[PDB]
Swiss-Prot record:
Monomeric heme protein which primary function is to store oxygen and facilitate its diffusion within muscle tissues. Reversibly binds oxygen through a pentacoordinated heme iron and enables its timely and efficient release as needed during periods of heightened demand. Depending on the oxidative conditions of tissues and cells, and in addition to its ability to bind oxygen, it also has a nitrite reductase activity whereby it regulates the production of bioactive nitric oxide. The keyword ATP-binding does not apply. It comes from Equus caballus (Horse). Signal peptide: none annotated. It is found in: Cytoplasm, Sarcoplasm. Its main location: cytoplasm. GO terms for cellular component: sarcoplasm. The gene is MB. GO terms for biological process: oxygen transport; removal of superoxide radicals. GO terms for molecular function: heme binding; metal ion binding; nitrite reductase activity; oxygen binding; oxygen carrier activity; peroxidase activity. The modification Phosphoserine is found at residue 3. This is Myoglobin. It is an enzyme of class 1 (oxidoreductase). Coiled coil: none annotated.
């Protein structure tokens, strides 16, 4: 788990996302898709996009970015007591969307990158530590459900 101090830092950083959830959610998926084009292939409805500019221009991409980061935000605000929130995501991502856990690692990395890129000099070493631990906690708990489902 995380200490109370660490959860405080996590949710303080999340304040930055909450002020522009769609812009942050869009940049996260653009960073995913451009750094790891295999990820793009899991979305039939984005799979049409060839270029980053079409990605930037895509209002449905922004919308999905909003859906995804809102769901992460809700999970983070449970400070690890997130069993009921994780279950359906584990199930849909492992069994319907067929998303290898490695791609959730790429996604977590993309969140860190995007925070530094939008807030350079304002995402301090303590905050990156705490945010990385929360994301790892999420991945570990999801990984347990994937194992249960035989996906990984
Ligand atoms: C923190 C990580 C993530 C969160 C919180 C998240 C959340 C969500 C949510 C709330 C939905 C809609 C509800 C559902 O289908 O369960 C969704 C749909 C989906 N997610 Fe994720 N997701 C995450 C990571 C990923 C990653 C890494 C990928 C692929 C590389 C992915 C692929 C998808 C796909 C394909 C859909 C279906 C999209 C559609 O409507 O056509 N997700 N995600
Ligand atoms: O909760 N103090 O690390
Ligand atoms: S997603």
């Amino acid at each position: 788990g995380l200490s109370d101090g660490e959860w405080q830092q996590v949710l303080n950083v999340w304040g930055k996302v909450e002020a522009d959830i769609a812009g942050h959610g869009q940049e996260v998926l653009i960073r995913l898709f451009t750094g790891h084009p295999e990820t793009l292939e899991k979305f039939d409805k984005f799979k049409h996009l060839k270029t980053e500019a079409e990605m930037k221009a895509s209002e449905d991409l922004k919308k999905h970015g909003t859906v995804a980061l809102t769901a992460l935000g809700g999970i983070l605000k449970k400070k690890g007591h997130h069993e009921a929130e994780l279950k359906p995501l584990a199930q849909s991502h492992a069994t319907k969307h067929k998303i290898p856990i490695k791609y959730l690692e790429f996604y977590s990395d993309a969140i860190i990158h995007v925070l530094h890129s939008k807030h350079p000099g304002d995402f301090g070493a303590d905050a990156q530590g705490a945010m990385t631990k929360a994301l790892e906690l999420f991945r570990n708990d999801i990984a347990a459900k994937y194992k249960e489902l035989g996906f990984q």
